[PDB]
């Protein structure tokens, strides 16, 4: 099996900048058959480059593939707001075909501190048997933000799941949502519910909190 390794993982470039994406092969891709695909969120991938360098009709001429053997490179001479999505490389010169793991090209902005909010569980949810505290991180850059759940000043772990929105098409900021899930009995045994947020834009960690029922 030929294993393709793309580099780098994530890409932080500005609108108008030159994007150079690398694809490294496990072994010499026979007959120079490497293909570059673009995939936006929600839609099926679109062929950008085939035969390592050849470009299909209808594709903007700002994309161009180069390299051979084991080293391949996709080049966007000028990044424009549209092309910020995920890029995959796929070898098809063998019987078995394999893709890469993708390379996310994001918009780079001037780092934004997150707008932190916290929501106690609903009265209806408590009367259903389960409790869920929601910590919201609104509009921030970069993605790297850590949320720690503190109940009665104790780092809770195991529960709580988190989700990050795709990069916004207007301000290019991510938004995180963490949801601490407990049962009602376990929820009522305590008073201080707090969420601690660490991020680049925050000099010191911001801890937003409430007390159960006040």
């Amino acid at each position: 099996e030929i294993v393709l390794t793309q580099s780098p993982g994530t890409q932080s470039l500005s609108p108008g900048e030159r994007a150079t994406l690398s694809c490294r092969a496990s072994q010499s891709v026979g007959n120079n058959k490497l293909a570059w695909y673009q995939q936006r969120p929600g839609q099926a991938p679109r062929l950008l480059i085939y035969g390592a360098s050849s470009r299909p009709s209808g594709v903007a001429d700002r994309f161009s593939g180069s390299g051979s053997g084991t080293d391949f490179t996709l080049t966007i001479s000028r990044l424009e707001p549209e092309d910020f999505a995920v890029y995959y490389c796929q070898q098809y010169g063998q019987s078995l075909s394999t893709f890469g793991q993708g390379t996310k090209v994001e918009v780079k902005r001037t780092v934004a501190a997150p707008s932190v909010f916290i929501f106690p569980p609903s009265d209806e949810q408590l009367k259903s048997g389960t409790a869920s505290v929601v910590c919201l991180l609104n509009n921030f850059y970069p993605r790297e933000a850590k949320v720690q759940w503190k109940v009665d000043n104790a780092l809770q772990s195991g529960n709580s799941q988190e989700s990050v929105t795709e990069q916004d098409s207007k301000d290019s900021t991510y938004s995180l949502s963490s949801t601490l899930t407990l049962s009602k009995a376990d929820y009522e045994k305590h008073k201080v519910y707090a969420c601690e947020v660490t991020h680049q834009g925050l000099s010191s960690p911001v801890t937003k909190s409430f007390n159960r029922g006040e």
Binding site: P45, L47, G102, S122, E162, S163, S177
Partner: protein, 224 residues
């Protein structure tokens, strides 16, 4: 131009076998290799296999070499993917792809790369039961730019469409990707930021539509 229309999304139980279709429109079909590529939620693309319809030469990926079966009916110009022995880690979006060409019909020097993709088919494999979502209010804190929202908790399966004020509210709206809970049910949150001076005048309701369970809830969120 060529286009590939696959079957609709479907929900299967662990152990059972699924069969997804893919019909070709325009161009030829017999002489261009047709592959299937699935994508797990948030993960990358993964090759499953391919078949050239004319020769019935099947090529499967080693990981699927036991449970996969790909065919192509020339009489209907339709390719079929059949996955046996489903399990929770098979939940993904299954795409039907076909290699492009340089010139239309049975000639047309084939390029090999998947230049023609389907609309995708969401196949969810879980031992849960189709349940409508419970919509709870995330009320704005009593203590501008205040944040309110709705927690769409415990449903199956994906997806769920959430709007605000029946669509008359788009600015500052964030609808997070659904997380898969340990219960086997999904859950997401839809938040929105509005001026704090506008909490007691404007009516903020979230509209949660869940296609598979045939459920629609219009929940009003107001300060406590």
């Amino acid at each position: 131009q060529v286009q590939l229309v696959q079957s609709g999304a479907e929900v299967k139980r662990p152990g059972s076998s699924v069969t997804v279709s893919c019909k070709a429109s325009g161009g030829s079909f017999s002489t261009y290799a047709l592959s299937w590529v699935r994508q797990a939620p948030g993960r990358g693309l993964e090759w499953m296999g391919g078949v050239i319809p004319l020769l019935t030469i099947t090529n499967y990926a080693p990981r699927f070499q036991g449970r996969i079966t790909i065919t192509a009916d020339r009489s209907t110009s339709t390719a079929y993917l059949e996955l046996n022995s489903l399990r929770p880690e098979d939940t993904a979006v299954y795409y039907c792809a076909r290699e492009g060409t340089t010139g239309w019909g049975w000639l047309g020097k084939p390029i090999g790369a998947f230049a023609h993709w389907g609309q995708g088919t969401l196949v969810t494999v879980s031992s849960a039961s189709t349940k409508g979502p419970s919509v709870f209010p995330l009320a704005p804190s009593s203590k501008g730019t205040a944040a309110l929202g709705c927690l769409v908790k415990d449903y199956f399966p994906e997806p769920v469409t959430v709007s605000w004020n029946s669509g008359a509210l788009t600015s500052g709206v964030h609808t997070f990707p659904a997380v898969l809970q340990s219960s086997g049910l999904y859950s997401l949150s839809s938040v929105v930021t509005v001026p704090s001076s506008s909490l007691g005048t404007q009516t903020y309701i979230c509209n949660v539509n869940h296609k598979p369970s045939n459920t629609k809830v219009d929940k009003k969120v107001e300060p406590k």
